[PDB]
RNA sequence: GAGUGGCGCGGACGCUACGCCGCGACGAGUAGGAGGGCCGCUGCGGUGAGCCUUGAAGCCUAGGGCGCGGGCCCGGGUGGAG
RNA sequence: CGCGUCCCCCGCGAGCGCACGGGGUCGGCGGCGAUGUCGGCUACCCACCCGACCCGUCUUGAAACACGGACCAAGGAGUCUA
């Protein structure tokens, strides 16, 4: 007849307008009940470290559980050792970085490798232009840039990451699925740093850049990044 | 009046000198042609400095415009008017070239039929 | 049927808007403005009458056609592009032309043009210099204004006056239009001293005179 | 999406404490006067 | 069959004709003339040619039948249209769609036509 | 439905 | 300057038989339609054995 | 009546001490000797005004002898007013400080 | 998906499938290996209703170009039979 | 921001228009144009700036005070058989 089949064809057209408006709310919900949690976050690490300071005790926050770690040297005259964990690490190239959640089992990895990196405990802006700017998926063994929602959703959905904002949440907060989250992200490529670097031979502790760098690395990231 | 092209971009060249072979100037034995340098010691083999450049795949002309001329077009070896009716239907992209032993008398037509076919020639008044 | 009302929120941002979509809710008040649900013209023509086809299909096709283009958005023509001034070039501020005939000359400049150049007369009598456009680029406004806000210049004379035609020969509308404006300015450049043939005088770049170090 | 509503909230609060802080001027002058 | 006798003439026909980085065929019935499995005049059962009249004005549209296609002379059937600018493409246009007689040829076809008309056009 |  | 190791990068699959017989080669053409057209792996199978030498597709007997 | 432009030398190439990029020129604008003072001539229209043997036509009027090669200061050179400036066609190294002209007039006064 | 109940005769490009196209990542290199050459030389079977005394081969060139390159195509001169 | 309904506390509205929205356009312009100028990157000669030792070879290492090479043409070296 072809008079249900336009008015078929649009009913359906017009589901999937109102499956993506469904989704689209959901997606705007989940980033600001994270503006909430990050809020709440922050806050509490003031809050805890006050209540400590007014009974004249020490609140010692709880070790990082998320680091930032930049490869700074090159790729000529490196042990076979110190080649693999760098390459384990997805640090393959000068200026390379990736997202490495701390254990027992990772330190000893990024102690391993000291001359060869410069990592730290990243900033939540840091990890925000890092996901939105050098963001880029791991989709088909393809750097397809991160320039949609349907493109994590695509890939992460299955562990409730349908967005940048979950991703962002899943890297900062090192969640159940950080594994997926961070292996899905392509190791950052990052520019040389804009003002210069101190020393790259020498540890940051002996006023070098090699190594560990607390709240440091926000420093290099914006000067990087 | 010119027969112009369909579309006429800009041909970008990352190189328009030759690939001289390294001692084609000192010697006249060596001709002006290249050759690698496949010596143990050689400074234009081993990418020495102020040296002779070596030919890579990199100097590669863009795909739109490789063999494409000046005029636009690319041209086409034109031996008589039955290699014209060829042409006719590549109107606009592609032009015919007269070879050098096609006969003054049979440019008069090969000229005069790919005017009529609205054909561009590089070399239209050559011998006459 | 209804009239088109203005944007009800302001532009609090390029881009943002100052209210959000539940106070714009309101604002509209969409919680009671709910909603439920020419080619082939015939001609008597003197064995019957015809029937003609306007948009005939063509009698030449090329061999072969150049594909259509993907479609951009934000390339809009030079007619419609957002026209930009600088905090130093007010109506009545005095412009050092740089690149034209009239190259160093202090001439006075009249309004912004609807085509972003400066609509220019540095008076007739004095610079030699007529109704006459420059560029913003192409002019340094000096740090020297006649309160020019109380002229009227005529709105007849606009961008399309200006545009050349294709020796030149001038028409007396160029002639009249330059002689009414000129009896509101030269009485007005004189209410300040000095200032007569400081506009006649020329710009120059003498020995020791860096422009980096002279604020005009 | 949430981003332009974060932004909006953002130049709205600042904007506010910039007009509480002229305020603030303009409550020393007048202190000062007296 | 087509596709068949298509996987022996691609490289070594007698019409091929390859030099300048170029690839034609001088088929008496290839229209774009150039090596394809479309516009092969040889190949196929249905084969619209478009050639110049035996006159000076007028294109002929060679149409080649259903019935002998292993008979060289009773094939192709002729057909001259010596009309306006127009309705010599629009003939064209009819003869292959209102036939359904192989419509990929359909606008290779007027181009051609077109450019045959363009050339027995006089110059100034 | 619930736009009515 | 990224260390990754070009010895294992261009696989040796075949992406067509060597040989030049057409009978052959037009099977291909029709199987390279329907590996990638059709859900079924059959296709993917035969399509890929096609490829093969005379050594790697042996007679299989009564 | 008067000199509309700003007295600069092509003092060198972009170079590396073992290497030189013909493509970027310095040039020293007599006046300003520093970073602070280097701001104004940015994005400056900049002319090489040599004159040849054989005549060329001339924007305005007759054919001259005197010909250019047109600029634009690029961004600011150094620690000391020196300034960048790329060219449309790359200097010949015969002007090795010798007069270019920063002109006035992408003026954003 | 499909069954049965409750006025206008119109629509560019394409796809030598050994083709066309899209997205990502990568590119040192002796000895050495393999691949691709519409690279080049000389004969052969085909083939181009090829070219040529209205001037073949060759040879020269401050001529026009083309190809990343091997090289090649033209313009001019010279030459006399392929 | 509906009502017609299903609990623990108190399935398509109808349009427009502007656009930081899956990679540039201008629906803007102005000049000079016949033996004196226009373009031609290439190719002839020349100058400047920076770089730049002479190739082949054996060698741990050659610009080497290692050896072959004054220069040019033609010839010249993984073949064929089992």
Redesign the pocket.
């Known amino acids: 007849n072809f008079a249900?089949?336009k008015?078929?064809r649009?009913?359906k057209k017009?589901?999937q307008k109102?499956?993506r408006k469904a989704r689209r709310k959901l997606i705007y919900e989940k980033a600001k009940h994270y503006h909430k949690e990050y809020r709440q976050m922050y806050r509490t690490e003031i809050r805890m470290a006050r209540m400590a300071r007014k009974a004249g005790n020490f609140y010692v926050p709880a070790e990082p559980k998320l680091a930032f770690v930049i490869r700074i040297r090159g790729i000529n005259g490196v042990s076979p050792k110190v080649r693999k964990v760098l390459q384990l690490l997805r640090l393959?190239?000068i200026f390379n970085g990736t997202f490495v959640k701390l254990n027992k089992a990772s330190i000893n990895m990024l102690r391993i490798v000291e001359p060869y990196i410069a990592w730290g405990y990243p900033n939540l802006k840091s990890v925000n232009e890092l996901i939105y700017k050098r963001g880029?998926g791991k989709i088909n063994?393809?750097?397809?840039?991160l320039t949609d929602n349907t493109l994590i959703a695509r890939s992460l959905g299955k562990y409730n990451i349908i967005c940048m904002e979950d991703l962002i949440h899943e890297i900062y907060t090192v969640g159940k699925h950080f594994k997926e989250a961070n292996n899905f992200l392509?190791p950052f490529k990052l520019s040389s740093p804009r003002g210069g670097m101190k020393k790259k031979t020498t540890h940051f502790v002996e006023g070098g850049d090699a190594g560990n760098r607390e709240d440091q690395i926000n420093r290099l990231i914006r000067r990087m990044n | 009046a010119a027969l112009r092209p369909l579309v006429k971009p800009k041909?970008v060249?990352?190189?328009?000198?030759?690939?001289i072979?390294?001692?084609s100037d000192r010697?006249?034995?060596?001709?002006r042609?290249?050759?690698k340098?496949?010596?143990?010691?050689?400074?234009?083999?081993?990418?020495?400095?102020?040296?002779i450049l070596?030919?890579?795949?990199?100097?590669?002309?863009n795909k739109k415009?490789?063999?494409?001329?000046?005029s636009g077009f690319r041209?086409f070896?034109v031996?008589?008017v039955?290699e014209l009716e060829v042409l006719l239907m590549c109107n606009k992209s592609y032009c015919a070239?007269?070879?050098?032993?096609?006969?003054?008398?049979?440019?008069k037509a090969i000229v005069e039929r790919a005017a009529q076919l609205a054909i561009r020639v590089?070399?239209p008044n050559?011998?006459? | 049927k209804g009239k088109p009302h203005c944007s009800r929120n302001p532009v609090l941002?390029?881009?943002?808007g100052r209210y959000s979509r539940?106070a714009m809710?309101?604002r509209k008040?969409?919680?009671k403005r709910?909603?439920?649900?020419?080619?082939?013209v015939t001609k008597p023509v003197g064995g019957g009458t015809r029937?003609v086809?306007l948009r005939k299909?063509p009698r030449y096709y090329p061999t072969?056609?150049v594909?259509?283009?993907?479609?951009?958005?934000?390339?809009?023509?030079?007619?419609?592009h957002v026209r930009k001034l600088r905090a130093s070039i007010t109506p009545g501020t005095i412009l050092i032309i740089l690149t034209g005939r009239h190259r160093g000359k202090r001439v006075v400049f009249l309004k912004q043009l609807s085509?972003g150049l400066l609509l220019v007369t540095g008076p007739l009598s004095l610079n030699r210099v007529p109704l006459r456009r420059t560029h913003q680029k192409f002019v340094i406004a000096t740090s020297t204004k006649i309160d020019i806000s109380g002229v009227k210049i005529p709105k007849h004379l606009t961008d399309a006056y200006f545009?050349?035609k294709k020796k030149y020969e001038i028409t007396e509308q160029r002639k009249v239009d330059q002689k009414a404006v000129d009896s509101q300015i030269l009485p007005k450049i004189k209410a300040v001293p000095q200032l007569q043939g400081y506009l006649r005088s020329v710009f120059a770049l003498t020995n020791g005179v860096y422009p980096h170090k002279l604020v005009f | 999406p949430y981003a332009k509503t974060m932004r909006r909230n953002t130049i709205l609060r600042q904007a506010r404490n910039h007009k509480l802080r002229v305020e603030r001027a303009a409550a020393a002058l007048a202190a000062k006067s007296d | 069959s087509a596709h068949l006798q298509?996987?022996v003439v691609?490289?070594?026909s007698?019409?091929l004709?390859?030099?300048?980085?170029?690839?034609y065929s001088?088929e008496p019935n290839n229209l774009?003339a150039?090596?394809?499995?479309?516009?092969n005049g040889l190949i196929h059962r249905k084969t619209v040619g478009v050639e110049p009249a035996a006159d000076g004005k007028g294109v002929v549209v060679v149409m080649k039948r259903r019935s002998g296609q292993r008979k060289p002379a009773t094939s192709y059937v002729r057909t001259t249209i010596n009309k306006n600018a127009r309705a010599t493409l629009?003939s064209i246009?009819?003869m292959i769609?209102?036939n359904k007689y192989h419509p990929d040829l359909?606008?290779?076809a007027i181009?051609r036509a077109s450019a045959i008309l363009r050339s027995q056009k006089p110059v100034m | 439905?619930?736009?009515? | 300057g990224?260390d990754?190791l070009?010895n294992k990068?261009r696989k040796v699959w075949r992406k067509?038989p060597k040989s030049?017989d057409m009978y052959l080669?037009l099977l291909?053409?029709l199987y390279?339609?329907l590996a990638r057209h059709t859900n079924s792996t059959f296709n993917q199978v035969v399509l890929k054995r096609l490829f093969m030498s005379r050594t790697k597709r042996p007679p299989l007997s009564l | 009546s008067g000199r509309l432009w700003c007295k600069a030398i092509f003092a060198?190439?972009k170079?590396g001490?073992?290497?030189?990029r013909?493509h970027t020129a310095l040039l020293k604008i007599e006046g300003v000797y520093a970073r602070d003072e280097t701001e104004f001539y940015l994005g400056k229209r900049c002319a090489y005004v040599y004159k040849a043997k054989?005549?060329?036509?001339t924007?305005?009027?007759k054919?001259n002898k005197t010909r250019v090669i047109w600029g634009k200061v690029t961004r600011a050179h150094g620690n000391s007013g020196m300034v960048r400036a790329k060219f449309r066609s790359n200097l010949?190294?015969?002007a090795?400080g010798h007069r270019i002209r920063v002109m006035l007039y992408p003026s954003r006064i």
């Open positions: 249900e089949l008015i078929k649009l009913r017009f589901a109102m499956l393959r190239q880029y063994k393809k750097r397809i840039a392509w | 041909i060249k990352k190189r328009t000198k030759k690939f072979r390294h001692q010697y006249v034995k060596i001709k042609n290249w050759r340098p496949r010596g143990i010691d050689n400074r234009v083999r081993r990418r020495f400095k102020g040296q070596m030919p890579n795949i990199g100097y590669g002309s415009t490789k063999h494409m001329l000046p041209k070896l031996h008589n039955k070239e007269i070879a050098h032993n096609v006969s003054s008398k049979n440019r590089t070399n050559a011998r006459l | 941002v390029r881009g943002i539940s809710y309101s008040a969409l919680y709910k909603y439920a649900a020419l080619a082939t029937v086809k299909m072969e056609d594909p259509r283009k993907l479609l951009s958005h934000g390339k809009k023509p030079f007619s419609q085509s545009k050349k | 298509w996987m691609r490289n070594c007698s019409f004709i390859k030099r300048n980085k170029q690839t001088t774009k150039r090596n394809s499995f479309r516009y629009s246009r009819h769609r209102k359909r606008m290779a181009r | 439905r619930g736009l009515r | 990224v990754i070009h990068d067509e030049q080669r291909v053409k390279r339609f | 060198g190439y170079r001490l073992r290497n030189q013909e054989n005549n060329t036509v924007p305005g009027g054919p010949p190294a015969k090795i």
